[PDB]
């Protein structure tokens with residue numbers, strides 16, 4: 842079972858676009874967290890493997906995923922980083938839970954199709 846890069850891009854990119862369409866919830870996820878710019882210099886002490894929407898998009902566009910689960914792993918790494926770093930009462934944390942709900946809804950029919 843081998844997946845062509847364009848097969849993964851066509852199937853999976855719409856699920857990433859579904860996340861981008863969430864406003865305001867996708868806004869903290871669209872670019873790599875910049876700890877110095879944001880004034881949160883502890884970020885990289887807590888989050889060892891950053892991930893965000895732009896990076897996943899680039900990996901999809903440049904054929905970095907060989908299997909659907911590798912893309913799913915990156916989306917979930919993004920979510921887990923956000924729940925790990927941010928407090929449960931914070932915007933980023935609540936927004937992460939919304940994106941996880943949206944992603945779950947969108948990814949399962951795509952997985953059934955792949």
Ligand SMILES: CNC(=O)N1CCc2c(c(N3CCCc4cc(-c5cnn(C)c5)c(C(F)F)cc43)nn2C2CCOCC2)C1
Nearest residue numbers: 865866868869870874879880881922923926927932933936
């Ligand atoms: C997954 N992202 C993640 O873990 N981050 C770490 C914490 C963080 C992020 C942002 N950014 C990044 C830039 C864009 C952005 C936009 C919004 C936003 C939401 N709606 N609108 C209209 C704008 C929000 C907001 F949700 F907090 C946060 C952020 N700030 N911080 C805090 C906010 C309190 O000060 C200290 C820094 C990312």
